[PDB]
Amino acid sequence: TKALFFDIDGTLVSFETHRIPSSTIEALEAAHAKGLKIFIATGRPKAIINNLSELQDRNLIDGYITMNGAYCFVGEEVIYKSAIPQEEVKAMAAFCEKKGVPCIFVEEHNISVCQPNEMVKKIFYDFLHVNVIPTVSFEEASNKEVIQMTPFITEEEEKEVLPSIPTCEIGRWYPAFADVTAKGDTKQKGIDEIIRHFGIKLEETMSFGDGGNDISMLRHAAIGVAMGQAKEDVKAAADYVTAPIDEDGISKAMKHFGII
Ligand SMILES: [Mg+2]
Ligand SMILES: [Mg+2]
């Protein structure tokens, strides 16, 4: 194994404590010293990655896959970025508008929210301490080149709009919102973009995840690891199920594979 891909929330950072376990930091320091490249693979836009300062201050991250693979970069170099078909951006906007539900629209250098409600303030601010996202109208947000949109819709509502965003990927790990990206843009695409830059082969990758939006990279990586507390469809997509995050699941999996 030469490249490791880690989802953030529920894989590196505990939803319960909001911290990265000490054994995870120790395991990544050991893998780093042995030459393994360590990559983040998150549905979060770079703008709101505010919980990795411990890995970042240790300079342990070699590259970032953000917005579920639609925005990837290594250092200061953007190696891959896509945008959602404008008509599908308009369709989702129209849908959220009709339904009276919030929706975040993320651009390369801007992030906005349309019709924010308590679910938005609670989840992103009170819970994840994310910076207040500026409010804008559905009309304005959907006139920009959007890399990822995050409608706060349930799985049932989702079924309602699928028909109007026919080529988009939808990744969901929570019942209250999903991340929508262009055709083919999932963490699996992010792995491919990243490894090409380092001359690393797919058979030399390992991914770690706990959510629905991790299923494609768990299947795609040579070895996929699901966190012990992930739902069963996430575990079924993996080659190995490790312990829950707060039971040293990352360090245990890495030890089990002989990486450290
Ligand atoms: Mg997660
Ligand atoms: Mg696999």
Automatic annotation (TrEMBL):
Mg(2+) 1 binds at D7, D9, D210, D214. Keywords: Hydrolase, Metal-binding. Pfam families: Hydrolase_3. Mg(2+) 2 binds at L218, A221, D239. This is Haloacid dehalogenase-like hydrolase. PANTHER family: PHOSPHATASE YKRA-RELATED (PTHR10000:SF25), PHOSPHOSERINE PHOSPHATASE (PTHR10000). PROSITE patterns: COF_1 (PS01228), COF_2 (PS01229). One of its GO terms (molecular function) is phosphatase activity.
